[PDB]
Amino acid sequence: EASVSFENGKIVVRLPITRPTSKIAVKKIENGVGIPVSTRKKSFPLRDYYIAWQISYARDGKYDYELSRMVRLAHEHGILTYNDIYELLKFADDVKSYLEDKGIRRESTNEELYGFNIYEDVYPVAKKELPSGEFIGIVLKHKQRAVGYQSMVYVCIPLTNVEPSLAGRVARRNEVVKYEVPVDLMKELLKAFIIASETHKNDIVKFLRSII
Amino acid sequence: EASVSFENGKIVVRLPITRPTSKIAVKKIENGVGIPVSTRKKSFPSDENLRDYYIAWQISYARDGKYDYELSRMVRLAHEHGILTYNDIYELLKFADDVKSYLEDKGIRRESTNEELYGFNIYEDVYPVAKKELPSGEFIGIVLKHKQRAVGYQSMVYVCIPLTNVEPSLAGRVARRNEVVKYEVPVDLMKELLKAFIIASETHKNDIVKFLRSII
Amino acid sequence: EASVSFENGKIVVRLPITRPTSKIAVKKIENGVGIPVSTRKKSFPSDENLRDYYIAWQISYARDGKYDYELSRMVRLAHEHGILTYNDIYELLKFADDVKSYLEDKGIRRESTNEELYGFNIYEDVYPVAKKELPSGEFIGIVLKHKQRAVGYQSMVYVCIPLTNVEPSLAGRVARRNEVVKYEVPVDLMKELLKAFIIASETHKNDIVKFLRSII
Amino acid sequence: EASVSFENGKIVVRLPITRPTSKIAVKKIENGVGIPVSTRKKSFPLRDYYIAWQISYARDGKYDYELSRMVRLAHEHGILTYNDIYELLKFADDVKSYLEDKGIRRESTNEELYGFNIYEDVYPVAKKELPSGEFIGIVLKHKQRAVGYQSMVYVCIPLTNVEPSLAGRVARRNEVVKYEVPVDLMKELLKAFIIASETHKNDIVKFLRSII
DNA sequence: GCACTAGTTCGAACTAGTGC
DNA sequence: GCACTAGTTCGAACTAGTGC
């Protein structure tokens, strides 16, 4: 439900902010944790607020969706040079372990709760912050209905970096905002998928080699 | 769904072995340690490996607002028949009086590390788990989940029942289509499952205390 | 879910009025005729229009293979308490002996017409519906649905309960959040719902006869 | 999950036949009724067997999907002339009532079943058969979760009209077949949507006027 | 606000495909 | 064939948007 385009020499994405889903939701960040927010009820003050986007690179087996759509448009308009794709391919070739390798572990402690021993389940999370304010997250979740893991990639875009400014008001009905996607972001998201798992890497490599 | 009955002086539960769901599924817990791993095995071994298989049951005490379901039906039947005594219930009410802190109070924390994965900073999200093991091999566990639409945590209680503890014996056997097995519920398991709910959250404790008071 | 109980000499069912589902929902049946139409009205009128509103309940007699659910719980409680007499049950068993044809036997037919809609030939698919009305206004209906994965038909039994027949009176009232209303189940309704299942399919009849035999 | 393309001067669709869904399923036809079939278990003999395709013309608000994709490709390659689009627009302008207008009615009868009165619920169905063997169906279903109706358009494509011939064998795993879409079919499907309802018509009209 | 319509998440139940 | 993985339909429960 995201809309990717090329406008004014810039890759832009238009994102809805009032219909929260697994894929797109506005969050308030406190101590790392992302509190959900309803953008229609409470008014905005702002550095605390992000669009949380679980971004994809394929759909129906097609690599012309969200991230891959942004990349194709960038490469065709010289935002993403052949040089950039080469080094991302080099990065990928150098990557030998993944977030999925780390897995999820259960550790004993020396604590009890009224006679019950306390253990801690430890989930790995990979994160990078761009100087522009965007966050990239890679979370490991226990694969639904199946053994093993799924790695999920998120981009977190501060409300201060979108237009129009939501400052001082509730979102309008079906409000959609526009975000100019910086080349750095596309690079780092491709890198995130590369390290998320070997199967995500193999996909990204085939796609970028596809851009030739 | 499980089916709970009173038979021959015991509380008995009949459990599906083959149609795994979030409520009831066979899981592998290797040497009784680690996160339970899901499985769809229908043929069970007859050596040391059998002891790694459990029925994992995310067990409840109410359904549709009524307390005649799974654990509450076990307990009401156990007390009706003198399996769970008045004294047993008074001891559990006393335990609940003493509990003033809960698994949900611990919540979930994110820890920074010093590792980087190819330039990306690594953090660790840390979930508290409460767990107790009975002498006969059953595990009672309490874990947390983020609430679906809210800012809080939901606590869930599980009992993990060794396949070596059910009938007909699964050792070296392949489960039939829609196989259901029979498990005699030990009184101490009912006690510990009540205690699990009592320490899971204040709301769960309040529910359990009102329920126990009502069966007296 | 409905909640069925014995109170003050009557079988009583408590029914949700506000969270419509395929099982239980408020529907408008204008002057008691036509296909029921779904609605999410929370404010109910106090004139002739009130009589067009019903609670439509797709009612069952078993859940999880057990016969202690909705209609079977009504009937077992009714018989325990002498509301539904032995003689009543013998009359229903006699009725079932006489039934040798079922709504499912009728099936669904496609009829050709002579109409065309801008060049396209018009056909009509025709579904049989069995329906009975009680003197106090309740409807008992039986309809067919194509089976989800099979070549057959599934029969479903519905009771449509006038809102004017429940408590607290809904006339000129707005339903509260998660409102539940109270309905006293007439013995003749229990009889006719059993008869409905008996004529719906041979399988349903067999189920009902075995159930009735078991409560004797 | 259908794949539309332009090959050899013909619009072709590639359809899977072993993963039956609401949208695509293989059926055996007897006395009008469409029996479902599992193409992997039982071997094929053949005029009795059709691919039943609940075809669409939009997706995510985009009119580049299934039917609309076929039409766009046809018009761009001269299979569907401007003349064809004009007359389809004329057809549409002439259409003043719809399948949805007919609704679904409950009729009394003089029959009883062991004391219960029998009524008949009557559902309208629109159908056309091409000389090539394809059927087009419009069925009225009681709109899920809502008042009123939904009209659904189906194309039924005989297995004798696809390649390869399934004669004498079970389908292979993930077997997909290719069907060359005749211009007549695209015309008649557009006509089906036009008469299905006024809202389907308004959509189709805006789309064809969009092709200009 | 009422009375919807439409969009979503979640779990149960089912089926086809995959690798050993 | 076993032991999964992945694709689907269906209903319950919830939320945002719409027209009056």
Numbering used by the authors:
A (entry chain B), D (entry chain B): 8 to 52, 57 to 223
B (entry chain A), C (entry chain A): 8 to 223
The authors write:
R.PabI is a type II restriction enzyme from the hyperthermophilic archaea Pyrococcus abyssi and belongs to the HALFPIPE superfamily. R.PabI recognizes the 5′-GTAC-3′ sequence and cleaves the N-glycosidic bond of the adenine in the recognition sequence. The structural analysis of R.PabI showed that R.PabI forms a dimer and possesses a characteristic highly curved β sheet, called the half-pipe structure, at the protomer-protomer interface. The N-glycosidic bond of the flipped adenine is cleaved by R.PabI by hydrolysis, similarly to DNA glycosylases.
In this study, we determined the crystal structure of R.PabI in complex with 20 base pairs of dsDNA, not containing the R.PabI recognition sequence, to uncover how R.PabI interacts with nonspecific dsDNA. To determine the R.PabI-nonspecific dsDNA complex structure, we utilized the R32A E63A double mutant of R.PabI, which contains residues 8-226. In this study, we determined the structure of R.PabI in complex with 20 bp of dsDNA at 1.9 Å resolution. The asymmetric unit of the crystal contains one R.PabI dimer (protomers A and B), one single-stranded DNA (ssDNA, chain C), and 162 water molecules. The R.PabI-ssDNA complex observed in the asymmetric unit forms a tetrameric R.PabI structure with a symmetrically related complex generated by the crystallographic two-fold axis (R.PabI protomers A’ and B’ and ssDNA strand C’). In the tetrameric structure, the 20 bp dsDNA is sandwiched by the half-pipe regions of two R.PabI dimers. Although the contact surface area between the two protomers is small (the contact surface areas between the A-A’ and B-B’ interfaces are 201.1 Å2 and 102.8 Å2, respectively), the two R.PabI dimers are connected by four salt bridges between the protomers. The interface area between the R.PabI dimer and the dsDNA in the nonspecific complex is 1156 Å2, which is approximately half of the interface area in the specific complex (2166 Å2). The structure of dsDNA between the two R.PabI dimers is slightly bent by ~20o at its middle region due to these R.PabI-nonspecific dsDNA interactions.
